[PDB]
Symmetry: D2
């Protein structure tokens, strides 16, 4: 389609400015958008019962950290309930974060659903009344959004069907967010599950990303006002491990071949990578001997929080200890984002954070 | 995608059987799926107040009609509220209809939304939790569904964007319905609005339908278990009218070129056509000297109800008068669906049932 | 694309009329378009030297057959060299065939070429100067054309790439032919090579054809002025054999789901099927209890000639015997194209004529 | 398609190396691939007769220029004829250029052909036996290839059909070239003809390029082994002229949004721009304050030769003069390729080198 309308200058500026801020040098995103159920799995793991109040308590720990955190954390992705919660003293979480100069993000998808007749593949739902939801979220202090699509590597997957549909849904989501003054983070996650090699992973990723950007173009999405949140290119979780060097080259090559320079930044997901791997891999990515026209940073969930949870262990007397773990890993990742992380300098970290059985 | 799963034999048989029943020789659909607001405008016209009870009363009128109706009406499309309503005596509407051997259908879309950056084009929403909704509707006695997409003829529209998106969303909706044992009626309505000619309307209609069937293919929809509800090919509302024969030819040519023989039947929408034109047009379509591999029938709302509303006028006394008008038109359309309607034989009917601008 | 031009009414009529003549009741095509080398293979099997004149002698036999042949043979596909060859008395082959009321076809593709980076897949070349080639062929007495694409069933094939490309090339070829008053036979051959089952062959076939018709639409090809030449749907050559009834159902389902009713006819290739099998299978297809909106006939090469060659055995004394075998099989296939063939009535026929390869 | 083969390491390295060489800092391409007829027009206007020897003569001039030319000219695109000509002393042109370290390119398309049914749109032909052609060209000293597609801005054009087809044929060409160790220059030319504004031109250019790179991905083309030759983004020839800065922003934005960083470089066509304009524009492009991950240089034809021909006039005594004009223009464009050109420092240049009517 050649006859279309570019967003107004006012809107372009606003969206570009938000995206630019999220990927400012030495900064990345803390993904704290776990739903009741998922968060519950994390709590149980440390003997803590999954109650609304326990969830609020944990988020309070994260959110009351020394303002030093804002040096490495540009933004936080929230789950719906958290956006409306308050600290012990009655201060809204939103207010605490804003005061520290952190940008608020919101998870807007409604999870995955099966593609009938496919070989166990999925798409993501949540477009219904998204514009209205976005207008409310924006008023309540949110400036960016998150939506997760899942692609699986198997004998015949991802299929053309899956690639086409996930690419299209991502474009619909992005368009809507942009209409309502919200920066969309596009997240086409190629799952690590399986025993395929790095070559297969690279080819899959390249195929997926090409479809994503063709769909964004078809739906006239303003690229400068978006971020991408892709998987790093690695072999399957059940295959031999690659070196940071190998991962970094395959990843940067895949992005160079598919993601336009107009895209403001890339905020990597960690998948099942340990806290340490996630950092070391990001650092190597920022040392690849190829032109890298976008900011390459992090958007980490488990990879920023496993040690935090372990340290806290549900006790008030361990709050400072938990916050300390967070500060350490944020700094480490901030260094990685500048390609200056020294392996093992932030400590041993966690073990594998791999949880299989996503989408379907 | 060549590796995929056909639906189970038992699911295939069920869907095909339902679709076959809906387009049985001499039968068509009564579309009574007007929402509160729409129904409200129609009532107001006959000096009736838009109360839930007045809507119930009018729907009671239609559904209590002499069982003779069933000879020409195979199915009724319901709006959510109506599916749970009851007659004065306390009998559920769903029971009244099913007792009469009429199949129940349900409108499942959640209306149109604007395509950002487009030249005033739309797509349709309502996929979220559709599978769960369908499962419940099936339980409650529904066997087919309705979902309306709107395409607009203008200087540059429909665009490629609009065509791709509307075709993809129809495919998703259809797939979901089938997974829940519900026959989807695929409805890509090209609006009559404008002063375009028959030539333009035919080319637009052929372009649209090709995309629709490619998308149904891409998503592995079982064609024998679907129906199509298209516009007839006519010049725009503000252009010179064409003859029944010109319309019929253009329409049949368009379908022959795009709709696979596997599609069980075509249930035409009336658009802005008067009750009489809608009947005459359908009859002429059923006399085009070209092979027509599918049933060619009706799925009429205003075109089966304008004279009913007029006759009733909100008066309890006038119930029989209204019902009689319904029987009159149902029979006329039943005849047209067989290419046997004698023009003007059922009366002049109503005026032009055109209301502009459906997308937005 | 909605703004485009239909062919002139005159061109529509001419193309439609030719297509219709080719598939008149009880008639099919004799593919005699073997190149030197290929013909050479054929002559060798019967102990005849591959010379220009031995090939000429053979073609002379075929073409000098009793005009009775025209009752069952509507058209003959020729190789370029043959179109300009003369019988011994100096009469042009073209004139002999035209005098008998047979329509002339010409093979215009320039063979297959590898898709670099693909898993041993191909596309077809021959578009360069095709318009001018067609204009000459038309002048020289040809009214239809032949172009062969090859798709291979394997682990990951046919791929999206292969499907996309083969469909697009077929569409370009068909549009060029039409512009020069030539009816294109669209031939997307899914090879029988392999050990796949009927299920796989059906899914592949339906996928391929959906893409073929979407491309024809994208390129604005006038369907009524075209024919389709597909494989019957069968399991692979190295898998268990299906019954004629199983093949027939799978084939007719596949066509009903993808080939628009506007397509004037389907002229099946025989693949590696024996003379008798090709006949029996065609008859079963014409007896499937489902709506078949197009003629279903034959376009046979080896399946029409194996026994001819054998009876002839390169000897002038065996001309009667040779021509008799042709008459017998043409009749048997004309009967089959009407669903009236009685198994074994035309004799045992050839062994298997399966030759492995194609594409490359 | 996710299952495919990357080119061998050896092939990758060779193609990347060639492309890198062509876009070396301060260097660009001399397009001297004018066909007999085209060259004839140029000569006619200088009052020289279009004879094979006249062409040979004029080409001798260009190629015999002071070896200093090689400082700003990385490569020369040749017309088939020229590749096999010799100087007066009988030194093959190919030999002359190579000794000077200039890389040889060859135009391999066979011109444009009409898309039947389109609103006067075209595609490009010349794929037939391209591999065998390329093999030979490589042996004969050529390392890169040229192929021109033409897109027209009009009321409804470029259409989806045109975009799809031109993108697809570029990908086929590129793939074949690569298979034969030849670097393809991808040239999707959007014509300047018309009275559209800069906004329209940018939107069209972005649409075209997105399709081109989707097609390259679909056909698995190695982007690092390619170059892009696009039009600068300007308003129509009959529209109000834009400033170099406006042109520059539009162009860089368009490229950033569509051309992967993996693409080794962009070598701009001049369209109908004057010699000075083409230089000033290129210089401004290399000054846009936005990241530009690829070399942005020239591939000029008329824009490098206009003044040469004028200086020459066909007189043997003006050889030195013509050669001097070439050197001056190459220097200025080399500077421009670095963003260092001082407006009007190279003379004045021709007036308008615009010739309307490219496709058809």
């Amino acid at each position: 389609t050649t006859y279309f309308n570019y967003p107004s200058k006012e809107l372009q500026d606003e969206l570009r400015e938000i995206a630019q801020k999220i990927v400012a040098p030495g900064k990345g995103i803390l993904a704290a958008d776990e739903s009741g159920p998922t968060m519950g799995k994390r709590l149980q793991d440390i003997g803590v019962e999954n109650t609304e109040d326990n969830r609020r308590a944990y988020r309070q720990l994260l959110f009351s950290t020394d303002p030093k955190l804002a040096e490495n954390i540009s933004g936080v992705i929230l789950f719906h309930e958290t956006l409306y919660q308050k600290a012990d003293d009655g201060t809204p979480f939103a207010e605490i974060l804003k005061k520290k100069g952190i940008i608020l993000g919101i998870k807007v998808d409604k999870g995955v659903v099966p593609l009938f007749g496919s070989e166990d593949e999925v798409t993501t739902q949540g477009l219904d009344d998204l514009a209205a939801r976005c207008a409310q979220y924006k008023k309540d202090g949110c400036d960016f959004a998150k939506w997760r699509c899942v692609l699986k590597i198997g004998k015949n997957t991802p299929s053309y069907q899956s690639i086409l549909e996930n690419a299209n849904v991502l474009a619909r989501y992005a368009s809507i967010c942009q209409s309502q003054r919200i920066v969309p983070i596009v997240e086409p996650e190629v799952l690590p599950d399986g025993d395929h090699d790095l070559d297969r992973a690279q080819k899959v990723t390249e195929t997926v990303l090409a479809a994503v950007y063709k769909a964004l173009s078809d739906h006239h999405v303003y690229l400068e006002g978006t971020l991408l949140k892709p998987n790093m290119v690695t072999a399957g979780q059940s295959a031999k491990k690659n070196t940071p060097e190998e991962i970094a080259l395959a990843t940067v090559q895949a992005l160079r071949r598919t993601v336009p320079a107009a895209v403001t930044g890339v905020t990597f997901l960690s998948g099942g990578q340990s806290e340490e791997e996630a950092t070391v891999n990001l650092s190597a990515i920022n040392n690849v001997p190829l032109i890298r026209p976008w900011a390459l940073t992090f958007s980490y969930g488990r990879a920023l929080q496993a040690s935090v949870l372990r340290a806290w262990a549900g006790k008030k007397e361990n709050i400072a200890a938990g916050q300390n773990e967070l500060l350490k890993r944020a700094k480490a990742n901030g260094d990685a984002a500048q390609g200056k992380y020294v392996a093992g300098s932030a400590g041993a970290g966690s073990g594998s954070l791999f949880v299989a059985n996503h989408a379907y």
